[PDB]
Design a protein around this ligand. Structure first.
Ligand SMILES: *[C@@H]1O[C@H](CO)[C@@H](O[C@@H]2O[C@H](CO)[C@@H](O[C@@H]3O[C@H](CO[C@H]4O[C@H](CO)[C@@H](O)[C@H](O[C@H]5O[C@H](CO)[C@@H](O)[C@H](O)[C@@H]5O[C@H]5O[C@H](CO)[C@@H](O)[C@H](O)[C@@H]5O)[C@@H]4O)[C@@H](O)[C@H](O[C@H]4O[C@H](CO)[C@@H](O)[C@H](O)[C@@H]4O[C@H]4O[C@H](CO)[C@@H](O)[C@H](O)[C@@H]4O)[C@@H]3O)[C@H](O)[C@H]2NC(C)=O)[C@H](O)[C@H]1NC(C)=O
Ligand code: XQR
Ligand code: CA
Ligand code: CA
Ligand code: K
Ligand code: NA
Ligand code: ZN
Length: 805
């Protein structure tokens, strides 16, 4: 109930909302059917439109007009935004040459440069180039300020998840806005684009920018705008708020536009109809900037121009139907379109089986335009598992396609020509970033970055302490002129042991054998030095990874590789080796095929044993340092140490062996050497974070050898590929992956073929940031380089995407 009988007299666009039954006058009142009776009349005036004209200059104040051109407007804070240009002969902001803003030039009473975030829905990255000719205001922001070629959204590339991510710095699995449509089973309640359930606060987790500011004494403009408030009115309202008294005036503001998403859905991303909405957004930017110029705030405010996601060509004829795969299509509920989320229709149907749904959806048709995944098997880069609102079964839809349950869902809902929601590495999904202002750099291009990183920057811009989030604070310091955040490296928590030779061969009863009984003071001292770390400078190029949790581990040196060996997990946490451009690849000699050797530095009690692998009919083993890349027949023996072995399913070994035998050498040839760090990951609860021992769900049969859920590799070289990786003076280049350790290759529909036709494709899908691996392992990499820490943080957030230009 709303007593709509009160008035908005002197309260239009009030910041502090009022509580029912009292009627509202804030910028969401329309959305709630709660505005006082006179809100339209008073707060949504449109008379005479939005632009001063020569004749109106100096007019008598008619309170009825949408904006004013009368002499006193600048003092009331309510002039039309072109007032000074039309009436007072000033130039539009966009006609002004750009001049570096070295310092904020703010009116008296301003305690910090305000921030205005100008958000645009569905603003695909390539519009900056393709629409350049019709967006002069945005082009000026872009060219004069700081911009990225693109900004990467989060998955799913839908509006609500992305805007909330921008506002929180969190992945959707952590803020809880996991799609535009959702069912939460604990609440037993559904979130929809339409209607009122979406307004309950229990859906929206984390702490968004406007709460962060208020909690720390920084006032905020409201970030949500009811759809029916026209853009011109939104801009005028922001400008009005900027003329409030110091003690009342917000320091952070946001504008939202539904375009160009709205027209993109109708016409596709580059439909001829798309030019006009681009034109209209640009004009809105111009109004804002002219208005700031009128207020003498154009060299005071930081402005961010940012999109939530891009847009792809999608038509109703590119739809796959689950009725063409499933016998029991009525037994499931699908969240449809550019992603799929499946669960049972009835929690009382005990004949529901995910296993059979997944099998029926896997590689059943040659051209299949989606792939099914149990959510924990999704690429870790998606961070899309750890929320009860995310259904166990997920469909990753090919770009340009939809999935639906039955044909009838499409035509009893071709209408539309664009959509979005696909894999966030897809080129069409990429969106935009521009920063303009005294705190941003001048005429600066930065590399692409992920939208999770902006919350921290927005906090830096306002002098706020960010709430805990998924950004890496400091990784975007290169965008900023000032207010940079200077973190320290995290402290190492566990120091390693450095064991020497402590065990005789006969103390080991592991059930392992090796044909190695083949016996020189020249090379006997040499091998000693290798075991004491003499080649470590070669193989450990950026220092040892630091262990950020309490544990017991040993550093093991070898000729060709260095490792950090866990006494708890009985295998390495990390193995580090460097392969030059000139390295030769060799085979595992016939005589050593099944060779496994006791490590006389590591107790039998803290070692794996071969008998467990023999008795586990499902599980095999591989090596972290690859015996194929041994520097000499003699050094190859190090590679068969029990301390280099890890559990591997035979299906996985196909992947791993191709990686090790072919791809590492390929990268070394292409990148002029590479440094490789590889290791296990355990993430049985699919939270993105290192498991403790008690979370481990699977062990090699009859033993305490835990089974990894994934294997990672970090592959580093010199960004200037004229310098060898092991003698690099400057910035580094990285590519990494987190490969799922699965007992089959059902993910790869071409896996019956030779590994050259499908392995690298898999690996590319499971590309990762170094930071993803750090979260997953409790390790901190690149501790000892000659580069600044912020530069290293940027490197750790890098994702090698494998998309074209
Ligand atoms: C990305 O960044 C984020 C933010 O830093 C990282 O997420 C954090 O990770 C922490 C560890 O995973 C997690 O810590 C837990 O917090 C519990 C208290 O949490 C509540 O309060 C905070 C503060 O106000 C709030 O942020 C939380 O918000 C979550 O939950 C509400 C719903 O109630 C949601 O609306 C909201 O979106 C958010 O959900 C997300 O997180 C929850 C888990 O919190 C997930 O389940 C969701 O799927 C979703 O992702 C909460 O309201 C705290 O109680 C936990 O403490 C346990 O563990 C300690 C270990 O020392 C132990 O000593 C305690 O005893 C305790 O265990 C007891 O409870 C267990 C469960 O019943 C039980 O098993 C035990 O037996 C014990 O009884 C824990 O510390 C932190 O809350 C989130 N924060 C956020 C915002 O998500 C995230 O990891 C980053 N991602 C990556 C990949 O790095
Ligand atoms: N609208 C409908 C969809 C939507 N979904 C989530 N949050 C919000 C609030 C919001 C608004 C603007 C931003 C940004 F800073 F990027 F500008 C960030 C967040 C909205 C607003
Ligand atoms: Ca959107
Ligand atoms: Ca975990
Ligand atoms: K076996
Ligand atoms: Na397969
Ligand atoms: Zn859309």
């Amino acid at each position: 109930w709303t007593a709509t009988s009160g008035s908005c007299k002197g309260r239009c666009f009030e910041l502090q909302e009022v509580g029912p039954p009292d009627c509202r006058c804030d910028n969401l009142c329309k959305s709630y059917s709660s505005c006082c009776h006179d809100f339209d009349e008073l707060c949504l005036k449109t008379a005479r439109g939005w632009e001063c004209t020569k004749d109106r200059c100096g007019e008598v104040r008619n309170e009825e007009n949408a904006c004013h051109c009368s002499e006193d407007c600048l003092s009331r804070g309510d002039c039309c935004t072109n007032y000074q240009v039309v009436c007072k002969g000033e130039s539009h902001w966009v006609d002004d040459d750009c001049e570096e803003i070295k310092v904020p030039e703010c009116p008296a009473g301003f305690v910090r440069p305000p921030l205005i975030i100008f958000s645009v829905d569905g603003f695909r990255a390539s519009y900056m180039k393709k629409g350049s000719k019709v967006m002069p205001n945005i082009e000026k922001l872009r060219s004069c300020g700081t911009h990225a070629p693109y900004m990467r959204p989060v998955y799913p590339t839908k509006t609500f998840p992305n805007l909330y991510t921008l506002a929180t710095g969190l992945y959707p699995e952590s803020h809880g806005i996991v799609g535009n449509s959702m069912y939460d089973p604990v609440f037993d309640a559904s979130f929809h684009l339409r209607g009122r359930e979406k307004f309950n606060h229990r859906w929206w987790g984390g702490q968004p920018l406007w709460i962060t500011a208020t909690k720390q004494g920084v006032r905020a403009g409201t970030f949500f705008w009811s759809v029916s408030i026209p853009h011109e009115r939104r801009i005028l309202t922001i400008l009005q708020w900027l003329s409030l008294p110091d003690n009342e005036r917000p320091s952070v503001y946001a504008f939202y536009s539904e375009q160009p998403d709205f027209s993109g859905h109708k016409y596709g991303p580059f439909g001829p109809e798309m030019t006009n909405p681009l034109r209209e957004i640009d004009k809105t930017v111009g109004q804002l900037m002219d208005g700031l110029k009128q207020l003498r705030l154009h060299r005071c405010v930081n402005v961010i121009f940012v999109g939530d996601h891009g847009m792809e060509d999608v038509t109703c004829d590119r739809t796959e139907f689950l009725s063409n795969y499933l016998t029991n299509v009525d037994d499931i509920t699908l969240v449809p379109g550019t992603l799929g989320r499946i669960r049972a229709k009835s929690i009382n149907n005990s004949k529901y089986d995910p296993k059979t749904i997944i099998a029926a959806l896997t590689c059943k048709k040659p051209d299949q335009h989606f792939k099914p995944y149990m959510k924990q098997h999704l690429p870790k880069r998606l961070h899309y598992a750890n929320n009860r609102r995310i259904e166990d079964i997920h469909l990753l839809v090919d770009r340009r396609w939809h999935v639906a349950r039955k044909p009838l869902d499409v035509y009893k809902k071709c209408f539309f020509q664009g959509d979005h929601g696909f894999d966030n590495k897809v080129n069409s999904m990429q969106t935009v970033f521009v920063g303009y202002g005294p705190t941003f750099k001048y005429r600066t291009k930065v590399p692409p970055f992920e939208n999770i990183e902006l919350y921290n920057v927005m906090c830096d811009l306002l002098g706020l302490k960010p709430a805990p989030n998924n950004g890496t604070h400091g990784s975007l310091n290169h965008l900023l002129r000032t207010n940079t955040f200077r973190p320290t490296m995290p402290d190492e928590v566990s120091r390693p042991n450095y064991p020497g030779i402590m065990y005789l061969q006969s103390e080991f009863d592991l059930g392992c054998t090796c044909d190695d009984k083949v016996e020189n003071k020249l090379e006997e001292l040499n091998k000693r030095l290798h075991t004491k770390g003499s080649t470590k400078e070669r193989h450990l190029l950026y220092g040892r990874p630091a262990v950020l949790y309490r544990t017991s581990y040993d550093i093991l040196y070898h000729t060709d590789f260095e490792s950090g060996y866990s006494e708890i997990f009985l295998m390495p946490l990390w193995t580090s080796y460097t392969i030059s451009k000139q390295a030769e690849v060799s085979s595992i000699p016939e005589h050593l095929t099944n060779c496994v050797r006791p490590d006389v530095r590591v107790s039998p009690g803290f070692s794996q044993n071969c008998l467990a692998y023999k008795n586990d009919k499902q599980m095999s083993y591989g090596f972290l340092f690859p015996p194929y890349l041994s520097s000499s027949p003699e050094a190859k023996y190090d590679a068969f140490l029990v301390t280099n072995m890890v559990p591997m399913y035979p299906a996985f070994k196909r992947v791993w062996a191709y990686f090790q035998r072919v791809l590492v050498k390929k990268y070394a040839s292409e990148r002029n050497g590479v440094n490789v760090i590889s290791g296990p990951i355990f993430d049985y609860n699919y939270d993105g974070l290192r498991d403790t021992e008690d979370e481990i769900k699977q062990y090699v049969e009859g033993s305490s050898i835990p089974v990894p859920t994934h294997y990672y590799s970090i592959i580093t070289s010199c960004l200037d590929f004229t310098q060898p990786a092991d003698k690099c003076d400057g910035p580094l280049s990285v590519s990494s992956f987190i490969l799922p350790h699965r007992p089959d290759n059902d993910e790869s529909c071409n896996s019956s073929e030779d590994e050259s036709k499908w392995v690298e494709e898999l690996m590319k899908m499971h590309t990762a940031r170094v930071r993803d691996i750090e979260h997953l392992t409790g390790l901190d990499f690149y501790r000892k380089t000659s580069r600044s820490y912020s530069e290293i943080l940027t490197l750790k957030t890098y994702l090698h995407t494998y998309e074209s230009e």
